[PDB]
């Protein structure tokens, strides 16, 4: 991209990542990096009450505790 | 593809079938384990009363039996609902894939 | 094991004898090739490719030509018959001189010193065509589709390729991938006729549709791609022990259901009615889509969904746990499953992504369908070529004798050793005049002169011979045109092969 | 044809309790366990004959080792009659098939 | 088409019942496993010294006086008797359920597919 003249060494590691900024901090410093090999993606609550689904109802009160 | 849609409707079909036949005798073996207690409660007291879990009739005080046997009532008293809990969801689960069969066909 | 000056001469012979017979088969005027087999199989073709198949190759150079032949065929499928005519010349020209003038190397670099001067000349002779004017594309197309000699219902449906391919032009990669063909996904219609064969937006989905699996007709409601990752989680993000006995049937297959019901909601939240789920579907994932009475279409192929991801032009869901209407079911979209002739045909249309359009192909039979599509296949490939470089170039020897001088002028300029490879390579350009002078049946040596005379002033700018007109002609007065795309490709292609075989002096067992 | 089915019963005959063995075979590993698991805590009996034989670990130790070995031994007797019966009924299959077709 | 599937349908129904008959009967063999465990449950529950009415022979039963709770059988090996410990026997009373349930339960999905194999022949036999 840009031009072969602007091709450059880059401070710190080369990082291609889907940018996490929804409003995430764009800059930080003294960064503790927690790199997640695993997705997070909303663990449910199936450990609490109402892990049983006979109805679409049982999805709601799981969605509050998750 | 309707194959697993036809596959799930067969498996959960025979899943739910058991909870119907058992639940009533579970009420019976509830009621009868009350009755068999009432049956020994018939004669006010006896030493020759037996309650046992096998070919052995281990000689037991009918009192501890009245407990144990109303306990044996409570055994089959509970199993009705866990079947009814089986009876509850499995009836809907077989139609889950069936709901998928027909809509895609209506679609 | 085959090695040495033999393979060197063998690099000549194979690519030579391949290219030799085939130039007669080049051109709208073309001299056909007969085949016979000890099996009795008879083949009458101007088609190198078809020839390139049933022929036998006992030399890997003759075999690797088929490879580089399929290269241009992988690329386009035409000019393959042309590409072989280039290197087969080159090695048959420079080498026996210059390999007995001793080098693999000189002409190799000169193959590039050849490759650029074309590009140089190409920046002159190739002049831009606009996709806004259909004929300005279609005249090339009319020229491209009459190459296979059906102008009948191909031409009007080549507008459809002039549209569908141009309208599936999309995906700028930032150096702009957009120029393309493949995203155009042909429709197959029993019944109808190429007259009423006309684009619908996105991709018209014939392939998995023999019957509606997606409603009947859907306008606003979103056609939705659910892509793997609809399988259950019995735990929060996890999966515990599965159904075994009584209450596990309840509890576990419920544990399976909630996570998917949770996945289900995000689909229904974006208001679908039809939902096309490729493999990785749960019956759990459908039945709440059934609870919303929103059809979930399961276990259907990827390209088809990518067709559908091109049909409403939605994406494929990369995080099916958190879903967006921006993900799948974009825009307003459309889904229309129409019986035309025999088969119900899902049309997922009103495409977001830059349009998208697929060629509606309606034959009465599938034959009168197929005859069009095959010549259509030329347009849609020339369309992408016009999409690739929209510079129409004069055909015939117009580019040939042009670059030849400019190469020999580069010989005059550079006056090195590779001047001789130029005069060897610039000699390769004259194929088209020779090919055309063959295919017209005229005298080349005058027309060779006369085309050098056409370059002596005009620089053969639009002037080659056209054997099809049989005379040295402006290709503007003949309206003969090709994109700079197809030229350099075919040009460069055998140049690479001219390097390739020349590299190979050795075969080892 | 009966020729197809003829030797398969004689076959599965020797296979029948051989299968029963292979559960006993598995439980012979378990009785080796449950002998090793019994230090004499509760009595160990080879039940052989309608008479209960008072028995010991070392009396049953070789034995269950001998049983498991023997409970592998009725395997080979079928393995004898395995390829006896399935093979000759394999020839018989064509014999009266065509004759009855004839 | 049809007659070969009239002929082939014969075995698949047996493959159904081969699997149908087998799975149902192992619960009967599991009955004794929990039984003997439970028979050993109430055994340890009360005491040694209770009267035991035990089967004498058909149409009859014989009484008896229980002097051993912790003395309890397991049937493993071949024809073999291991009298085990109250918890030992229970453990195998327990555990003999576990392995047998595996061989038993595996049979049910194969039951379906043999019918799904027969039912598939039925259609193509009728179609």
From Swiss-Prot, chain B:
One of its GO terms (molecular function) is unfolded protein binding. One of its GO terms (biological process) is chaperone-mediated protein folding. Heterohexamer of two PFD-alpha type and four PFD-beta type subunits. InterPro entries: PFD_beta-like, Prefoldin. This is Prefoldin subunit 1. It comes from the Eukaryota. Pfam families: Prefoldin_2. Belongs to the prefoldin subunit beta family.
UniProtKB/Swiss-Prot annotation, chain C:
The modification N6-acetyllysine is found at residue 207. The modification Phosphothreonine is found at residues 415, 444. InterPro entries: Chap_CCT_gamma, Chaperone_TCP-1, Chaperonin_TCP-1_CS, Cpn60/GroEL/TCP-1, GroEL-like_apical_dom_sf, GROEL-like_equatorial_sf, TCP-1-like_intermed_sf, TCP-1_chaperonin. Transmembrane segments: none annotated. There is a cross-link at residues 233-234, 366 (Glycyl lysine isopeptide (Lys-Gly) (interchain with G-Cter in SUMO2)). ADP binds at residues 27, 79-82, 147-148, 396, 467-468, 482, 487. CDD domains: TCP1_gamma. The modification Phosphotyrosine is found at residue 232. Mg(2+) binds at residue 78. ATP binds at residues 27, 79-81, 396, 467, 482. One of its GO terms (molecular function) is ATP-dependent protein folding chaperone. It is an enzyme of class 3 (hydrolase). Keywords: Acetylation, ATP-binding, Chaperone, Cytoplasm, Disease variant, Disulfide bond, Hydrolase, Intellectual disability, Isopeptide bond, Nucleotide-binding, Phosphoprotein, Ubl conjugation. The keyword Endoplasmic reticulum does not apply. Its main location: cytoplasm. GO terms for cellular component: cell body; chaperonin-containing T-complex; cytoskeleton; cytosol; extracellular exosome; microtubule; zona pellucida receptor complex. Its EC number is 3.6.1.-. It is linked to Neurodevelopmental disorder with speech or visual impairment and brain hypomyelination: An autosomal dominant disorder characterized by global developmental delay, impaired intellectual development, poor or absent speech, and brain abnormalities including hypomyelination, cerebellar atrophy, and optic nerve atrophy. Some patients have severe visual impairment, dystonic movements, and seizures. Belongs to the TCP-1 chaperonin family. This is T-complex protein 1 subunit gamma. It comes from Homo sapiens. The lineage of its organism: Eukaryota, Metazoa, Chordata, Craniata, Vertebrata. The gene is CCT3.
Curated annotation (Swiss-Prot), chain D:
The modification N6-acetyllysine is found at residues 9, 54. Keywords: Acetylation, Chaperone, Isopeptide bond, Ubl conjugation. GO terms for molecular function: amyloid-beta binding; protein-folding chaperone binding; unfolded protein binding. One of its GO terms (cellular component) is prefoldin complex. There is a cross-link at residue 54 (Glycyl lysine isopeptide (Lys-Gly) (interchain with G-Cter in SUMO2)). There is a cross-link at residue 54 (Glycyl lysine isopeptide (Lys-Gly) (interchain with G-Cter in SUMO1)). GO terms for biological process: chaperone-mediated protein complex assembly; chaperone-mediated protein folding; negative regulation of amyloid fibril formation; protein folding; protein stabilization. Belongs to the prefoldin subunit beta family. Binds specifically to cytosolic chaperonin (c-CPN) and transfers target proteins to it. Binds to nascent polypeptide chain and promotes folding in an environment in which there are many competing pathways for nonnative proteins. Heterohexamer of two PFD-alpha type and four PFD-beta type subunits. Component of the PAQosome complex which is responsible for the biogenesis of several protein complexes and which consists of R2TP complex members RUVBL1, RUVBL2, RPAP3 and PIH1D1, URI complex members PFDN2, PFDN6, PDRG1, UXT and URI1 as well as ASDURF, POLR2E and DNAAF10/WDR92. This is Prefoldin subunit 6. It comes from Homo sapiens. The gene is PFDN6. The chain holds residues 13 to 114 of 129 of the full protein.
Curated annotation (Swiss-Prot), chain E:
The modification N6-acetyllysine is found at residue 32. It comes from Homo sapiens. Heterohexamer of two PFD-alpha type and four PFD-beta type subunits. Binds to MYC; interacts with its N-terminal domain. It comes from the Eukaryota. Keywords: Acetylation, Chaperone, Cytoplasm, Nucleus, Phosphoprotein. Belongs to the prefoldin subunit alpha family. Highly expressed in pancreas and skeletal muscle and moderately in other tissues. The gene is PFDN5. The modification Phosphoserine is found at residue 46. One of its GO terms (biological process) is negative regulation of amyloid fibril formation. The lineage of its organism: Eukaryota, Metazoa, Chordata, Craniata, Vertebrata. This is Prefoldin subunit 5. The keyword Lipid metabolism does not apply.
């Amino acid at each position: 991209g840009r031009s072969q003249m602007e091709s450059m060494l880059i401070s710190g590691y080369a990082l291609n990542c889907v940018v996490g900024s929804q409003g995430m901090p764009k800059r930080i410093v003294n960064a503790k990096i927690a790199c997640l090999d695993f997705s997070l993606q909303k663990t449910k609550m199936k450990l609490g009450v109402q892990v049983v689904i006979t109805d679409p109802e049982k999805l709601d009160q799981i969605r509050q505790r998750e | 593809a309707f194959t697993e849609l036809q596959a799930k409707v067969i498996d959960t079909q025979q899943k739910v079938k058991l909870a119907d036949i058992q639940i009533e005798q579970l009420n019976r073996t509830k009621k009868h384990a009350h009755l068999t207690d009432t049956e020994i409660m018939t004669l006010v007291d006896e030493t020759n009363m037996y309650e046992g879990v096998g070919r052995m009739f281990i000689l037991q005080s009918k009192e501890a039996i009245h407990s144990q046997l109303l306990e044996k009532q409570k055994i089959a008293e509970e199993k009705i609902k866990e079947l009814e809990q089986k009876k509850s969801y499995l009836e809907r689960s077989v139609k889950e894939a069936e709901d998928n069969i027909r809509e895609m066909l209506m679609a | 094991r085959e090695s040495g000056r033999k393979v060197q001469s063998g690099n000549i012979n194979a690519a030579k004898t391949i290219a030799d017979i085939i130039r007669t088969c080049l051109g709208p005027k073309s001299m056909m090739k007969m085949l016979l087999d000890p099996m009795g199989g008879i083949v009458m073709t101007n088609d190198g490719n078809a020839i390139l198949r049933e022929i036998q190759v006992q030399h890997p150079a003759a075999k690797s030509m088929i490879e580089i032949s399929r290269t241009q065929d992988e690329e386009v499928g035409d000019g393959t018959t042309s590409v072989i005519i280039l290197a087969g010349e080159m090695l048959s020209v420079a080498e026996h001189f210059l390999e007995q003038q001793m080098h693999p190397t000189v002409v190799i670099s000169a193959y590039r010193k050849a490759l650029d001067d074309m590009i140089s000349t190409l920046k002159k002779i190739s002049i831009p065509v606009d996709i806004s004017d259909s004929d300005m594309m279609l005249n090339i197309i009319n020229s491209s589709i009459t190459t296979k000699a059906i102008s009948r219902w191909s031409s009007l449906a080549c507008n459809i390729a002039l549209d569908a391919v141009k309208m599936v032009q999309f995906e700028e990669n930032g150096r702009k991938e957009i120029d393309i063909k493949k995203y155009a996904r042909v429709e197959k219609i029993p019944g109808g006729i190429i007259e009423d064969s006309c684009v619908l937006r996105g991709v018209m989905i014939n392939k998995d549709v023999t019957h509606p699996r997606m409603r009947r007709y859907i306008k606003n409601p979103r056609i939705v791609l659910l892509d793997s990752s609809l399988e259950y989680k019995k735990g929060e993000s996890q999966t515990d022990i599965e159904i075994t006995r009584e209450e596990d049937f309840t509890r576990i297959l419920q544990m399976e259901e909630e996570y998917i019901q949770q996945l289900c909601e995000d689909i229904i939240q974006l208001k679908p009615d039809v939902v096309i789920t490729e493999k990785g579907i749960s019956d759990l994932a459908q039945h709440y889509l059934m609870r919303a009475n929103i059809t979930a279409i399961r276990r259907v192929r990827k390209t088809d969904n990518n067709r559908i991801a091109r049909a409403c032009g939605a994406r494929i869901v990369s995080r099916p746990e958190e879903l967006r209407e921006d993900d799948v079911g974009t825009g307003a979209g459309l889904l229309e499953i129409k019986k035309i002739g025999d088969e119900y045909f899902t049309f997922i249309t009103d495409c977001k992504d830059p349009k998208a359009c697929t060629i509606l192909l309606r034959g009465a039979s599938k034959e009168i369908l197929s005859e069009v599509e095959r010549n259509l296949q030329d347009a849609m490939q020339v369309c992408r070529n016009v999409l690739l470089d929209p510079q129409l170039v004069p055909g015939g020897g117009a580019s040939e004798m042009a670059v030849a001088h400019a190469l020999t002028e580069k010989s005059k300029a550079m006056t090195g050793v590779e001047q001789w490879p130029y005069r060897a390579v610039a000699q390769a350009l004259e194929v088209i005049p020779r090919t055309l002078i063959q295919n017209c049946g005229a005298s080349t040596i005058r027309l060779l002169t006369s085309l050098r005379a056409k370059h002596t002033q005009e620089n053969c700018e639009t002037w080659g011979v056209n054997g099809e007109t049989g005379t040295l002609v402006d290709m503007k007065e003949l309206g003969i045109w090709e994109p700079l795309a197809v030229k350099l490709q075919t040009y460069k292609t055998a140049v690479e092969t001219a390097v390739l075989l020349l590299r190979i002096d050795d075969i080892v067992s | 044809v009966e020729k197809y089915q003829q030797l398969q019963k004689d076959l599965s005959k020797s296979m029948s309790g051989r299968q029963k063995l292979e559960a006993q075979l598995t439980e012979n590993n378990i009785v080796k366990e449950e002998l090793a698991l019994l230090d004499g805590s509760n009595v160990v009996f080879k039940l052989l004959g309608p008479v209960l034989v008072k028995q010991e670990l070392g009396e049953a130790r070789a034995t269950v080792g001998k049983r498991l070995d023997y409970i592998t031994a009725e395997i080979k007797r079928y393995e004898s009659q395995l390829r006896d019966l399935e093979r000759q009924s394999e020839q018989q299959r064509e014999t009266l098939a065509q004759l009855q077709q004839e | 088409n049809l007659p070969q599937l009239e002929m082939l349908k014969n075995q698949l129904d047996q493959e159904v019942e081969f699997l149908s008959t087998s799975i149902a009967q192992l619960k009967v063999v599991q009955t004794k496993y929990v039984e003997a465990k439970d028979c050993l449950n109430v055994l340890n529950k009360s005491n040694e010294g209770k009267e035991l009415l035990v089967p004498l022979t058909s149409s009859m039963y014989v009484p008896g006086k229980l002097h051993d709770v912790e003395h309890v059988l397991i049937d493993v090996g071949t024809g073999y008797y291991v009298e085990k410990t109250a918890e030992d026997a229970k453990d195998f009373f327990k555990r003999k359920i576990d392995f047998l349930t595996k061989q038993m339960e595996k049979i049910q999905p194969a039951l379906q597919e043999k019918h799904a194999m027969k039912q598939a022949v039925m259609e193509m036999m009728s179609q």
